[PDB]
């Protein structure tokens, strides 16, 4: 019916892709070898997963994904893991030297060597689709290969297709935690080059996920495993509207239609609820109104920021499972009544709602208790302007002394690019400041 | 895949690298015959990064041995692991350096460098993807210093886009082992600062302090100090060999750790370090490793880092850990000791986690610090070198090899400029 290509770029991209495809194979009942334990229909039907899995041979489902990285270790880990016999061998593209957290490398020097092969594979996958609607790109701003190659691939895809939607799930640089010293430059350059070529980029934060795990899941040692599992839950809740029939279905275009008021402000924040451990699951009655109220608590944001510091421009409520539309209506009315949550005056209709019948599925050996209903929420708020200002301040602090600058300059990154990116980021901050002023 | 060409030069080179290859062969299950007899697939998954496979289940370490007198090489060849090394790569002279940098750089190195570079080219052409060159050598040693400077210059000219990493043994602050060590060190750094990508400074005196103090050793040997240095070396490149939650190759370390092209020297550290008896009374947690790493007494460099500030910090962890735990510990470190970090670099700490712990440990961590405090080493070297040069101390031994006063003058001036640059970057300026 409809189709969507999932592109995984870099370390975080490939890891989140592993988690996401595990969750999809669990939801649709697809064995790790592409087979179905209930393989009663072959090569068609509904069988609504035709969007994500192509039908080949007889009874083998092949995910419509492309894994790209310049460092072969994580792709080899995929090539020897549980799902090594699931993915098509031609879907795994590797370079031989990653970008070393240098945006210049992944954008100019190394990315130009495999960008053509990646685009050729993407075209071969898209030519097999009939209702291709969107592209999913998973990457982290700080990671050089992710950042640079993602910028390059986004430009190339925006040129090649143009009218296909381009959604991004990306790990925003944490306000306190960092893994690379040069995350500010990579982040600023990637944002500057990516802004006008993305329809909607969803923000997540590893530090916020740490806090969420510790508070709600009661887990003291939540490594990248729990982070990836929560991100995969969010992605699956976003794509469930396409994959399963709902009482109120939502395609991919409606997201950028409802969440992007201005072409330059398309950074919604992801949230998820309920997130409870199995121990407190039997001391809790998860109603619709309670999950709706918990969705707007600042302690459950996947991005470390204070939504009370800004105003909301658009909020999308995606419900799954045993959900009554009247309860959703009343809960939205109550949320709008709550005077602590402020919306921009020029958006009197600030909610978009979607209800799907498919309840969420818990991964065996997972952390979240099984629930009969869940809500994935995507909100575009002006609170991320403070995070943008923090990133710009860090960039200024590092760039006033030209710290790490020779590393980028040597790769062909002319110095004026940094000034252009800085002015563009200042302009984005000005945009956020202006749209947040009532009249 | 990525491959590393390990070049051994000098007595430090030969001994430290013999211990290093012992440790590496132990980690990959390679017995002294070269035949693989391990127990895990990850040992052979990235065996090619340090080994060449000659059909017959035999693996040859991609190492090049360089010296100017065959004694140390005979000792290495006759000892453990002698038969695994393919005998093609024992390239030695006959005269020795006599601890004279001028000799080893202009006469003996000039005679032997052609054979050494031919061996280097042979090993490099056989590679699949050459990643970088690792050099183990001393600075006070004439053979090490001179041959290493010459080889680094020649190889940098040969491959200008590869990673040039060196692990140098630096002069001690109190007990020097060579009369002409200051001149050798000055003339060595005068080229290392120009041709190398990063240099790890190891002091034998700091290792002795760690051995008597932490490990409670009473009879430490140069071999045990080499064991510590080899554990550090193995921890540095654990991401080039085994998978993990967050990997980092050598170029990533070079990018994240060198802010400006000339300030590339680093202070290495290691954790955990315990005596045998105290092992039964201390648990291995990420806070424990973090507190052991950021400790002045655990720094293998001859300087108290609390006298200056850090520019970049690398912390590569080994073993199953929680990333939240490591990140919280790094946040605590940066917050409680913010006065020890330069204000013009937010997010001073770079991290990486490999899932394979060292042999016998549940978890470990390797420390790499770029601190302005290392200016003490270069300032002491400049002071001693100036005091010796004012009286032309041992100057004829170097002028007889072709050196003039202008070369020493330029070396000393560049050293003073490097010290001045480190001092300049201690200003907050904001």
């Amino acid at each position: 019916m409809r189709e969507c290509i999932s592109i995984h770029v870099g370390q975080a991209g490939v890891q989140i892709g592993n988690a996401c495809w595990e969750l999809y194979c669990l939801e649709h009942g697809i064995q790790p070898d592409g087979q179905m334990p209930s393989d009663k229909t072959i090569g068609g039907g509904d069988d609504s997963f035709n969007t994500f899995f192509s039908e080949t041979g007889a009874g083998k489902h092949v995910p419509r994904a492309v894994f790209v990285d310049l460092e072969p270790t994580v792709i080899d880990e995929v090539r020897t893991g549980t799902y090594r016999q699931l993915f098509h061998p031609e879907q795994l593209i590797t370079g031989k030297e990653d970008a070393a957290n240098n945006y210049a490398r992944g954008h100019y020097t190394i990315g130009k060597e495999i960008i053509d092969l990646v685009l050729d594979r993407i075209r071969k996958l898209a030519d097999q689709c009939t209702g291709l609607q969107g592209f999913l790109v998973f990457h982290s701003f700080g990671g050089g290969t992710g950042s640079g190659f993602t910028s390059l691939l986004m430009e190339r895809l925006s040129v090649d297709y143009g009218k296909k939607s381009k959604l991004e799930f990306s790990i925003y640089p944490a306000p306190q935690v960092s893994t690379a010293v040069v995350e500010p430059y990579n982040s600023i350059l990637t944002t500057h080059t990516t802004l006008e070529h993305s329809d909607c980029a969803f923000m997540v934060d590893n530090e916020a996920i740490y806090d969420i795990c510790r508070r709600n899941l009661d887990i003291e040692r939540p490594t990248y495993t729990n982070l990836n599992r929560l991100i995969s839950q969010i992605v699956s809740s976003i794509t469930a509207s396409l994959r399963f029939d709902g009482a109120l279905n939502v395609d991919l275009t409606e997201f950028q239609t409802n969440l992007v008021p201005y072409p330059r402000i398309h950074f919604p924040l992801a949230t998820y609820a309920p997130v409870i451990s199995a121990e407190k699951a039997y001391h809790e009655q998860l109603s619709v109104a309670e999950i709706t109220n918990a969705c707007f608590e600042p302690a459950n944001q996947m991005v470390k920021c204070d939504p009370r510091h800004g105003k909301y421009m658009a909020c999308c409520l995606l419900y799954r499972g045993d959900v009554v539309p009247k309860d959703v209506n009343a809960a939205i009315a109550t949320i709008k009544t709550k005077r602590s949550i402020q919306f921009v005056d020029w958006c009197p209709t600030g909610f978009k709602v979607g209800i799907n019948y498919q309840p969420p599925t818990v991964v065996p050996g997972g952390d979240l208790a099984k629930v009969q209903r869940a809500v994935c929420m995507l909100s575009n708020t002006t609170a991320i302007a403070e995070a943008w200002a923090r990133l710009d301040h860090k960039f200024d602090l590092m760039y006033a002394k030209r710290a790490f600058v020779h590393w980028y300059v040597g790769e062909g990154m002319e110095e004026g690019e940094f000034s252009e990116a800085r002015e563009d980021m200042a302009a984005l901050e000005k945009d956020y400041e202006e749209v947040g002023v009532d009249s | 895949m990525r491959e590393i060409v390990h070049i051994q030069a000098g007595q430090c080179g030969n001994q430290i690298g013999a211990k290093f290859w012992e440790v590496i062969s132990d980690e990959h299950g390679i017995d002294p015959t070269g035949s693989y007899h391990g127990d895990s697939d990850l040992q052979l998954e990235r065996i090619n990064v340090y080994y060449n496979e000659a059909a017959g289940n035999k693996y040859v370490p991609r190492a090049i041995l360089v010296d100017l007198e065959p004694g140390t090489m005979d000792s290495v060849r006759s000892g453990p692991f002698g038969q695994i090394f393919r005998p093609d790569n024992f390239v030695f002279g006959q005269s020795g350096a006599g601890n004279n940098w001028a000799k080893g750089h202009y006469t003996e190195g000039a005679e032997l460098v052609d054979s050494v570079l031919d061996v280097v080219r042979k090993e490099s052409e056989s590679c699949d993807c050459l990643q970088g060159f690792q050099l183990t050598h001393s600075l006070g040693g004439g053979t090490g210093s001179g041959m290493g400077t010459l080889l680094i210059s020649k190889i940098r000219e040969e491959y200008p886009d590869r990673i040039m990493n060196t692990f140098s043994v630096v002069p001690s602050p109190k007990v020097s082992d060579t009369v002409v060590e200051p001149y050798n060190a000055t003339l060595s750094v005068h080229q290392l600062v120009e041709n190398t990508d990063e240099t790890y400074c190891i002091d034998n005196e700091a290792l002795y302090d760690i051995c008597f103090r932490t490990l409670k050793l009473t009879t430490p040997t140069y071999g045990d100090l080499n064991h510590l240095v080899s554990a550090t070396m193995s921890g540095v490149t654990t991401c080039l060999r085994f998978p993990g939650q967050l990997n980092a190759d050598l170029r990533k370390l070079a990018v994240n750790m060198v802010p400006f092209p000339r300030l590339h020297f680093f202070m290495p550290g290691f954790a955990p370090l315990t005596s045998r008896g105290s092992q039964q009374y201390r648990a291995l947690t990420v806070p424990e490793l973090t507190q052991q790493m950021f400790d002045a007494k655990n720094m293998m460099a001859a300087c108290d880092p609390r006298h200056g500030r850090y520019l970049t910090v690398a912390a590569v962890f080994r073993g199953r850990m929680s990333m939240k735990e490591v990140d919280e510990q790094m946040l605590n470190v940066q917050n409680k000791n913010s006065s020890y970090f330069v204000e013009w670099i937010p997010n001073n700490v770079k991290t990486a986690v490999c899932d394979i712990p060292p042999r016998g440990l549940k978890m470990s961590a390797t420390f790499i610090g770029n601190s302005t405090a290392i200016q003490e080493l270069f300032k002491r070297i400049s002071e001693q070198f100036t005091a010796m040069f004012r009286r032309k101390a041992f100057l004829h031994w170097y002028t007889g090899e072709g050196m003039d006063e202008m070369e020493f003058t330029e070396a000393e001036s560049n050293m003073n400029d490097l010290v001045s640059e480190y001092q300049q970057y201690q200003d907050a300026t904001a």
Binding site: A427, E429, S439 | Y425
Partner: peptide, 25 residues
């Protein structure tokens, strides 16, 4: 005989790009 490479950095005057006030009249 060296000096730190410190530059006077400023984003002096940056205007917004989204015409959020274009139809305010």
């Amino acid at each position: 005989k060296v000096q730190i490479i410190n530059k006077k950095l400023d984003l002096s005057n940056v205007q917004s790009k989204c015409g959020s006030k274009d139809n305010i009249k």
